[PDB]
Design a protein around this ligand. Structure first.
Ligand SMILES: *[C@H](C)[C@H]1/C(=C/C2=NC(=C\c3[nH]c(C[C@H]4NC(=O)C(C=C)=C4C)c(C)c3CCC(=O)O)/C(CCC(=O)O)=C2C)NC(=O)[C@@H]1C
Ligand SMILES: *[C@H](C)[C@H]1/C(=C/c2[nH]c(/C=C3N=C(/C=C4\NC(=O)C(CC)=C4C)C(C)=C\3CCC(=O)O)c(CCC(=O)O)c2C)NC(=O)[C@@H]1C
Ligand SMILES: C=CC1=C(C)[C@@H](Cc2[nH]c(/C=C3N=C(/C=C4\NC(=O)[C@H](C)[C@H]4CC)C(C)=C\3CCC(=O)O)c(CCC(=O)O)c2C)NC1=O
Ligand SMILES: C=CC1=C(C)[C@@H](Cc2[nH]c(/C=C3N=C(/C=C4\NC(=O)[C@H](C)[C@H]4CC)C(C)=C\3CCC(=O)O)c(CCC(=O)O)c2C)NC1=O
Ligand SMILES: C=CC1=C(C)[C@@H](Cc2[nH]c(/C=C3N=C(/C=C4\NC(=O)[C@H](C)[C@H]4CC)C(C)=C\3CCC(=O)O)c(CCC(=O)O)c2C)NC1=O
Ligand SMILES: C=CC1=C(C)[C@@H](Cc2[nH]c(/C=C3N=C(/C=C4\NC(=O)[C@H](C)[C@H]4CC)C(C)=C\3CCC(=O)O)c(CCC(=O)O)c2C)NC1=O
Ligand SMILES: C=CC1=C(C)[C@@H](Cc2[nH]c(/C=C3N=C(/C=C4\NC(=O)[C@H](C)[C@H]4CC)C(C)=C\3CCC(=O)O)c(CCC(=O)O)c2C)NC1=O
Ligand SMILES: C=CC1=C(C)[C@@H](Cc2[nH]c(/C=C3N=C(/C=C4\NC(=O)[C@H](C)[C@H]4CC)C(C)=C\3CCC(=O)O)c(CCC(=O)O)c2C)NC1=O
Ligand SMILES: C=CC1=C(C)[C@@H](Cc2[nH]c(/C=C3N=C(/C=C4\NC(=O)[C@H](C)[C@H]4CC)C(C)=C\3CCC(=O)O)c(CCC(=O)O)c2C)NC1=O
Ligand SMILES: C=CC1=C(C)[C@@H](Cc2[nH]c(/C=C3N=C(/C=C4\NC(=O)[C@H](C)[C@H]4CC)C(C)=C\3CCC(=O)O)c(CCC(=O)O)c2C)NC1=O
Ligand SMILES: CCC1=C(C)/C(=C/C2=NC(=C\c3[nH]c(/C=C4\NC(=O)[C@H](C)[C@H]4CC)c(C)c3CCC(=O)O)/C(CCC(=O)O)=C2C)NC1=O
Ligand SMILES: CCC1=C(C)[C@@H](CC2=N/C(=C\c3[nH]c(C[C@@H]4NC(=O)C(C)=C4CC)c(C)c3CCC(=O)O)C(CCC(=O)O)=C2C)NC1=O
Ligand SMILES: CCC1=C(C)[C@@H](CC2=N/C(=C\c3[nH]c(C[C@@H]4NC(=O)C(C)=C4CC)c(C)c3CCC(=O)O)C(CCC(=O)O)=C2C)NC1=O
Ligand SMILES: CCC1=C(C)[C@@H](CC2=N/C(=C\c3[nH]c(C[C@@H]4NC(=O)C(C)=C4CC)c(C)c3CCC(=O)O)C(CCC(=O)O)=C2C)NC1=O
Lengths: 164, 177, 362, 52, 160, 161, 177, 148
């Protein structure tokens, strides 16, 4: 996975050197930023269900055309498949959030997504309506800590800026 | 290559469920541990050359067949290849110390080694002996009980970590055989 | 030569898009000479232009002449790799001590980044060497159009992981031809010549010796978890794994048989289901944020872990019957590979026992 | 009530005759279970039909 | 079957069959070929009864095929029409038997426990069987669909 | 029947001895796990119907058994089937909350193998239904309590097999 | 890569004799066929991507294991590689339709594909299912009896060519297993 | 066996569809061995005793062949060999004669299993089968040691 310590040890391995103080300071910043984004990880594992539910409900609240038959979504199965897709995305935000960096998220979710989504008539604007709904429904002090919330923001925005 | 984090993440992805608190709790300690691992890696990577010299020298000392003609360490070139192989082994072990998981060691160094030495006729028992000597030397530096060099650190308990390092070298010594 | 040459050679020669999909992600990177003070492309370039073989300083002095120009930046990466190939070190490691067949195959391995395609290219390079010699053959290597399409002039040659592999044996032969990450190219026989003449898949276990490692596989490669034993015990475990695979294959044939038996009976009612006019409570029209799950309680996550999880029908449930047996069959198909790997490794140990002379000469 | 017209263990040894090994020979192939079901269902008869 | 019921009752009384019951069996075995005509017609017209009865069911009752409902989706609607096919078939068994003992023991004894264990509203099942009764009465004669329709009425009385 | 307490008083009684420190260690073990067993029994009491519904949906429906010819094909036999799953869940809860499977020896496994082998109830399907209840129940009560219920459902499965 | 022409020529070379009239007569039946094969390839290559989408989606529908975390289809990467593999398979089949002989298909895909998917862990029965669905969909397009798209073509008889295409997909589906 | 399969089954089919050949072969060669074991007072002299002799040859080859399917001769040991030599002593049956007949059955079996027997040339693709031949001779000298 792309992460702190895998970038540094991958660089030291490609370079063929002993691990000097640079990699040590990198993992120092990993272990110092850690507490915040792990708190965000805890709360994401807390309420993921309602996240996915409001995400998809606001997604079809914006795009009502999908429900009409012949569209991407029209079968108990299709809308079910919408929720499953969103749920996978939030779980990968939780995994990349715990790891740190974009390595876990990028290789599972983003790599090769263009072929799939372009193939299967899947509009990205529905996903982005879901994620920007979650990012607007976020909060500053009430549910989370502000600093960790910034981390959450970053990861969600990354998904948006890898989608369209 | 997956580190502590990626190990937890992979396990949770195969389980297809969010990592949650349990996995986050074990992770917190890894994070809460921290600088012990940092200073450990600094100790082994500091005196790394010297570890490799002493271990390979000891390994030639126990059975002098290596430097005997027809042995695999007889040539100056072969002695140099010997030294750089021990160095690289120690290098990957230090990578696995910063990682917390042996996935770097499994993928980058363990993947194709036994076959290589079998193809070149390198005696595997001798290699496991040299891995063992680097294990003892590395644990001696990592506990700061080294008889030559004893540097000041803020004191405490670092036994766990020593058990981890011993596990890495046992992985390599089990692999080469 | 003058014979029609089949296939497209290397596709990646247009449209670099399929590097995202394949195993190319879990390679480290290519070393691209972009800014000044290079210091990296020299290292990875010497890593791949040789076979991970250990080079000392006294033998880097042979091509330091070519290293100087390139550290200055006067020549390109292509001309530097070419001047490395013309040097005596590459002759001594690969030309002078190795028979020719392996030498040509290693020229494909290091230079173009791929295995040979056919007997046609292979005999073509036999004619190139027979008519022009060593230097002319290396010039034929670096002066390919395929090189200038893919590797350019600023990237060092890397092992190529395109999406298609118009001969699939090109993929099998390049994964066989490359070793592991920690696998040096010395004392090794001719790997590919048996697969080149009268085209065969090389092996089942050997191909995955060459692949870059995937983090999340659905079956862990059970290397270093096999217990220690003599050969015939492992061959017996091979025979057990094969018999269990036969049982699982017959079981899957039963599974597909039953599924088609239910589905062909139920498809009439599926046609009546496509016949009906069936309208939703608010389905025809109405924009009011309708509830997609009015039977959720507080914890259900009804959609499920896979989408088709919660759903079950007359024909959906036998799919859940099939998938389990598919998974176990894939487990034991991954077992056979590692067993044959262990038998091949221990057999290779039997052919060449490691011997050290016991007394020193003093 | 089932009557089982049941052959002994030495009866299956009797199957070795070139004729019998030709007829029931391919049942030793591993996939053939429904054929064994047909043979063994041919040996079982409902109701009770014994001697007198 | 009527004959079976009569025999069982006689066996319980441990006597021979009465004059009356034998007279009844005579009336039954003389009414046989008319019954076999009825079950022949309901046999060879089953797809119209299941399809058209399912259409009238889902058009009268848009609950169960709505999202949220028990029969929502293609596979669930196909299972719904599969059960209407079951009941239609049993009704044919009850016509040739001359008694609802096949209908009762194959389909009705413990039906409410099953559909309550499936989450299915059984009143929708009874509305479905009533819809197939209307179609099956549209495919038959006057007295004929009186008889067969009354077998359907027995199934309705068991569902409600 | 007997719980863990009664079983300790049985061994200590049949030796004639009083309660020594080992038997008190066994009663301390049961009295530590007591509350966990209580809340597990509460949850299973709450969701019995949903356990049987989800376990029948996993294990038994849309297969040869509810297809014609199978043993669940009619509504009479469906209702008898889910009746029996009810009994397995209820007595498995008693066995969990007693801490001793003697109730399963006395009031379930007695005569039932003779019964099913007489009528033609398939044992395999029954065992798979009980294991489906084991997975669903463990999903409701959690890990520890799911291990406890797991030994009693496995006890019934070992009884019928 | 050998078409029907080169197959006749190679068969005449095996016997080291001139092709003659008989083979030329059958060749006149092939060439006199011609635009039936042209319009057929135009039909399959027209609706190709939609064939691949429907077939792979149906293949995921028949066994849910691929969808769940475990199977290759789960995640975007693997789903993309699955779609391009179905596309490549259909591509080579259309190559065999223009060719008239399966030579292009046998060497390129059939010879070394099973070992490759065994080395990657791809389930082969799923692949044969996908090849079967591409077969039924391709024969339905090739007979112009597809339930969604029916374009006007001058009528005639094209059954034998449908049998040829079905034979190529049965060759691929027999090969992948 | 998953490697053997059609080859081991092929061998068993070779020995089985030559059964009357091997039996009548070895028993007729047993009689043409010694003229004292056809003459008056011989076990085989009585018409009935000759019939049981042919039956015993057929039973030996049948259980031997069966073992060839069953890998080890546990099937053979439980019924076929269990209680043999005690019976042949208790009925006055000569044992040297039976040991000779089992040896002739062994030689004819290996010559059929390797197709070196001139006269039967059933068409199989060639292979190595020496191991399996040694299992066949292994079984016949298990029994041939048990008769003596
Ligand atoms: C020293 C203690 C040994 C000794 C080592 C030798 N290794 C030789 C060659 C060789 N070794 C490898 C494996 C190594 N190279 C790597 O880069 C990595 C991991 C990243 C490993 C595990 C390879 C691939 C090769 C071939 C290329 C090369 O020559 O460098 C070697 C040369 C001769 C030989 O094959 O033995 C030596 C001497 N050999 C000894 O006998 C002592 C005990
Ligand atoms: C359901 C998961 C399986 C199944 C069950 C099935 N059971 C029966 C009939 C009976 N079952 C019992 C069971 C019990 N009696 C007890 O005292 C206890 C312990 C408390 C148990 C578990 C009894 C007595 C009967 C018969 C009479 C009666 O119930 O009152 C049937 C009926 C079969 C028939 O032909 O009659 C069925 C079908 N069926 C399956 O396929 C599942 C595996
Ligand atoms: C690891 C991450 C990961 C994802 C993110 C998903 C992404 C994804 N979704 C689908 C597939 C699908 N995804 C949806 C979802 C949609 N329904 C709509 O109405 C909306 C537009 C949208 C929800 C917001 C639907 C309906 C399908 C099925 C499409 C079809 O078959 O027509 C597929 C193809 C395989 C399949 O059918 O399941 C994939 C790869 N899968 C993964 O493995
Ligand atoms: C794990 C991620 C995660 C989220 C992103 C949130 C998202 C979220 N917020 C609310 C719910 C809410 N969120 C807020 C937050 C606020 N509203 C305001 O007007 C303020 C500006 C802002 C605080 C800064 C409020 C006030 C509610 C309750 C009422 C509402 O919907 O606004 C709900 C409904 C349940 C509830 O009432 O708690 C959900 C799912 N919850 C989560 O668990
Ligand atoms: C970039 C390089 C770099 C290093 C080399 C380390 C060095 C280092 N170690 C500690 C901190 C520490 N280091 C150790 C380690 C020791 N335990 C013992 O038994 C031994 C004497 C010794 C290992 C050989 C311990 C125990 C602490 C915590 C001390 C304490 O809190 O009491 C700290 C203070 C911050 C912290 O608590 O983590 C620092 C800066 N950190 C870095 O950033
Ligand atoms: C094949 C023939 C061949 C040569 C003749 C050399 C020529 C040469 N020298 C340098 C490079 C150099 N050459 C020198 C040498 C000098 N130091 C001084 O004090 C003196 C003026 C002078 C020795 C008499 C130095 C110092 C550099 C490095 C210059 C720098 O980096 O600043 C470079 C650039 C690449 C490099 O840094 O090595 C080249 C091409 N290289 C070749 O390949
Ligand atoms: C010229 C012909 C030709 C082919 C036929 C393919 C065959 C092929 N497929 C893959 C590779 C792949 N193929 C699949 C496909 C699968 N996904 C599943 O769920 C199913 C089991 C299966 C579709 C039916 C997947 C998922 C990968 C990527 C595997 C991985 O990286 O884990 C690779 C390795 C390179 C790559 O990653 O693309 C190759 C050579 N390539 C070619 O050049
Ligand atoms: C360069 C591109 C190119 C094409 C795409 C074809 C298109 C094409 N097809 C036909 C002609 C034909 N095409 C078909 C094909 C069909 N048979 C059926 O059952 C289906 C509806 C359909 C295949 C899917 C038939 C049967 C004829 C002959 C029609 C006839 O003579 O009645 C003709 C007239 C000349 C001839 O008879 O060959 C042409 C131009 N030709 C070309 O040059
Ligand atoms: C149901 C009955 C039944 C049989 C009788 C066998 C028949 C049989 N034998 C082989 C196949 C074979 N059979 C033999 C046998 C031998 N070859 C020699 O030269 C020796 C004379 C002889 C020693 C026994 C060999 C060597 C092969 C090929 C190697 C092999 O398949 O293992 C095959 C493989 C398929 C084929 O060849 O077409 C089959 C089906 N299998 C059965 O299922
Ligand atoms: C299951 C395995 C099995 C066997 C192996 C046989 C072994 C056997 N043979 C005989 C019996 C016999 N066996 C022979 C055979 C012989 N005639 C000779 O000339 C030779 C010495 C020898 C053949 C090589 C004869 C002649 C008898 C009858 C002896 C007599 O009545 O005098 C009997 C006594 C019952 C009977 O009369 O049939 C038995 C148990 N029976 C079995 O059930
Ligand atoms: C011969 C006597 C007999 C009957 C009748 C019978 C019915 C029966 N109906 C079932 C399901 C079902 N039946 C229905 C029926 C309906 N849904 C509605 O909304 C409507 C009111 C109604 C259709 C008219 C549905 C939706 C299911 C599946 C529900 C689910 O699985 O979630 C099942 C579950 C498994 C399976 O079908 O294979 C059985 C066994 N079984 C029998 O042996
Ligand atoms: C005669 C042939 C010969 C050798 C050569 C040595 C080699 C040697 N060093 C060891 C082990 C060893 N070696 C060192 C490193 C070393 N010690 C220091 O204090 C400094 C400054 C060092 C580098 C200069 C340490 C620190 C240890 C651990 C033991 C200790 O605490 O000293 C061990 C023990 C291995 C084990 O525990 O399994 C051996 C065999 N032994 C021999 O028989
Ligand atoms: C619920 C899981 C599921 C699926 C997914 C489908 C998949 C599917 N498509 C088929 C077959 C099929 N599919 C298509 C292609 C398809 N139809 C069109 O008209 C257009 C425009 C298409 C692409 C968008 C055609 C043209 C056929 C041939 C039948 C026909 O005439 O429609 C067949 C029949 C296979 C056979 O004949 O052996 C199946 C199973 N079926 C399932 O059960
Ligand atoms: C004159 C009194 C007399 C006999 C009677 C024979 C009997 C006889 N057959 C033998 C052996 C023998 N017999 C046969 C069977 C036989 N051959 C066939 O090819 C067919 C179809 C057969 C049945 C019709 C085979 C197959 C062999 C093995 C030798 C061979 O390869 O032919 C052997 C060799 C025994 C040994 O190897 O120890 C003998 C003694 N010999 C005699 O001296």
């Amino acid at each position: 996975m792309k992460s702190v310590i895998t970038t540094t040890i991958s660089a030291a391995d490609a370079a063929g050197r002993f691990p000097s103080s640079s990699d040590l300071e990198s993992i120092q910043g990993n272990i110092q930023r850690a507490s915040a984004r792990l708190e965000a990880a805890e709360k994401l594992s807390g309420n993921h269900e309602a996240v996915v539910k409001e995400a998809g409900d606001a997604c079809f609240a914006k795009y009502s055309y999908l429900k009409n038959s012949g569209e991407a979504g029209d079968s108990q199965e299709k809308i079910n498949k919408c929720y499953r897709d969103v749920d996978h995305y939030m779980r990968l935000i939780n995994y990349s959030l715990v790891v740190g960096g974009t390595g876990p998220l990028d290789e599972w979710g983003i790599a090769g997504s263009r072929e799939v989504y372009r193939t299967l008539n899947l509009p990205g604007s529905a996903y982005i309506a879901s994620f920007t709904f979650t990012r607007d429904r976020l909060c500053v002090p009430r549910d989370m800590s502000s600093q960790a919330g910034v981390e959450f923001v970053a990861a969600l925005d990354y998904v948006i800026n890898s989608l369209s | 290559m997956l580190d502590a984090f990626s190990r937890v993440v992979v396990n949770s992805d195969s389980k297809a469920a969010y990592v949650g608190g349990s996995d986050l709790q074990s992770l917190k300690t890894f994070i809460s541990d921290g600088n012990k691992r940092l200073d450990a890696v600094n100790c082994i990577v500091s005196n790394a050359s010297c570890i490799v010299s002493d271990a390979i020298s000891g390994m030639i000392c126990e059975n002098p067949g290596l430097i005997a003609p027809g042995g695999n360490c007889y040539t100056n070139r072969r002695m140099a290849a010997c030294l750089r192989d021990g160095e690289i082994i120690l290098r990957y072990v230090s990578y696995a110390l910063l990682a917390g998981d042996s996935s770097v060691l499994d993928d980058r160094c363990l993947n194709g080694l036994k076959e290589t030495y079998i193809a070149l006729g390198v005696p595997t028992a001798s290699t496991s002996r040299a891995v063992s000597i680097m294990k003892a030397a590395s644990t001696a530096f990592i506990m700061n009980t080294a008889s030559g060099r004893k540097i000041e650190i803020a004191a405490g308990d670092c036994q766990a970590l020593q058990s981890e390092a011993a596990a890495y070298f046992d992985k390599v010594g089990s692999a080469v055989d | 030569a003058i014979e029609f040459q089949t296939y497209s050679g290397g596709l990646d020669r247009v449209s670099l898009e399929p590097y995202s999909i394949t195993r190319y992600l879990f390679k480290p990177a290519p070393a691209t000479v972009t800014d000044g003070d290079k210091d990296v492309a020299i290292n990875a370039g010497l890593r791949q232009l040789f076979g991970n073989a250990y080079i000392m300083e006294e033998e880097r002095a042979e091509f330091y002449n070519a290293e100087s120009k390139f550290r200055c930046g006067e020549i390109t990466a292509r001309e530097f790799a070419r001047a490395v190939a013309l040097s005596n070190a590459y002759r001594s490691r690969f030309f002078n001590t190795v028979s020719q067949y392996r030498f040509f195959e290693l020229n494909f391995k290091h230079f173009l980044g791929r295995a040979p395609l056919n007997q046609v290219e292979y005999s073509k390079h036999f004619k190139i060497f027979a008519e022009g010699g060593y230097e002319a053959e290396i010039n034929s290597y670096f002066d390919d159009p395929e090189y200038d399409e893919v590797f350019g002039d600023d990237c060092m040659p890397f092992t190529r992981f395109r999406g298609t592999y118009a001969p699939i044996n090109q993929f099998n032969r390049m994964c066989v031809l490359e070793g592991g990450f920690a696998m040096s190219d010395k004392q090794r026989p001719v790997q590919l010549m048996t697969s080149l003449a009268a085209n065969v898949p090389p092996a089942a276990y050997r191909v995955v010796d060459g692949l870059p490692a995937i983090p999340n596989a659905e079956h862990p490669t059970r290397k270093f978890e096999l217990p220690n034993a003599s050969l015939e015990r492992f061959r017996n475990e091979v025979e057990v794994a094969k018999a269990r695979e036969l049982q699982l294959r017959v079981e899957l044939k039963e599974a597909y048989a039953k599924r088609d038996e239910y589905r062909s009976g139920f498809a009439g009612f599926r046609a009546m289901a496509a016949d009906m006019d069936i309208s939703m409570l608010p389905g025809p029209r109405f924009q009011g944020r309708v509830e997609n799950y009015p039977t959720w309680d507080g914890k259900s996550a009804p959609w499920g872990k896979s989408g088709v999880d919660t759903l079950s029908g007359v024909e959906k449930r036998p799919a859940k019957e099939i998938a389990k047996k598919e998974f176990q069959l894939e487990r034991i198909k991954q077992l056979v590979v590692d067993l044959e790997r262990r038998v091949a490794v221990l057999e290779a140990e039997r052919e060449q026992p490691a011997l050290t002379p016991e007394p020193l000469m003093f | 009530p089932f009557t089982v017209f049941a052959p002994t263990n030495d009866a299956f040894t009797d199957l070795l005759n070139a004729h019998g090994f030709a007829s029931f020979g391919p049942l030793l192939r591993p996939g053939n279970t429904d054929t064994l079901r047909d043979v063994l269902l041919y040996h079982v008869v409902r109701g009770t039909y014994d001697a007198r | 079957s009527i004959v079976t019921k009569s025999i069982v009752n006689a066996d319980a009384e441990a006597r021979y069959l009465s004059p009356g019951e034998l007279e009844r069996i005579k009336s039954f075995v003389l009414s046989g070929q008319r019954r076999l005509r009825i079950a022949q017609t309901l046999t060879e017209n089953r797809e119209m009864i299941v399809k058209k009865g399912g259409q009238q069911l889902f058009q009268k009752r848009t609950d169960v095929v709505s999202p949220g409902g028990n029969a929502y989706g293609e596979e669930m609607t196909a299972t719904c029409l599969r059960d209407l096919d079951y009941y239609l078939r049993l009704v044919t068994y009850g016509i040739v038997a001359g008694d609802v003992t096949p209908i009762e023991e194959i389909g009705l004894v413990g039906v409410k426990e099953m559909y309550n264990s499936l989450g299915t509203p059984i009143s929708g099942v009874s509305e479905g069987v009533r819809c197939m009764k209307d179609v099956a009465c549209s495919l038959l004669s006057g007295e004929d669909s009186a008889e067969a329709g009354f077998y359907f009425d027995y199934t309705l009385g068991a569902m409600q | 029947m007997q719980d863990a307490i009664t079983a300790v008083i049985n061994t200590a009684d049949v030796q004639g001895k009083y309660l020594d420190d080992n038997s008190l260690d066994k009663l301390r073990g049961y009295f530590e796990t007591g509350e966990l067993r209580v809340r597990a029994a509460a949850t299973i009491a709450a969701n019995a119907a949903t356990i049987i519904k989800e376990s029948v949906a996993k294990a038994l429906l849309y297969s040869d058994i509810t297809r014609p010819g199978g043993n669940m094909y009619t509504t009479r036999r469906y209702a008898a089937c889910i009746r029996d799953l009810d009994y397995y869940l209820r007595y498995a809860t008693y066995g969990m909350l007693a801490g001793d499977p003697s109730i399963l020896d006395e009031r379930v496994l007695n005569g039932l193998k003779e019964t099913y082998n007489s009528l033609g109830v398939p044992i395999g399907a029954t065992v798979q239904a009980i294991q489906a209840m084991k997975e669903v129940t463990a999903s409701l009560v959690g890990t520890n309590a799911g291990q406890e219920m797991a030994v009693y459902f496995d006890y019934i499965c070992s009884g019928l097999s």
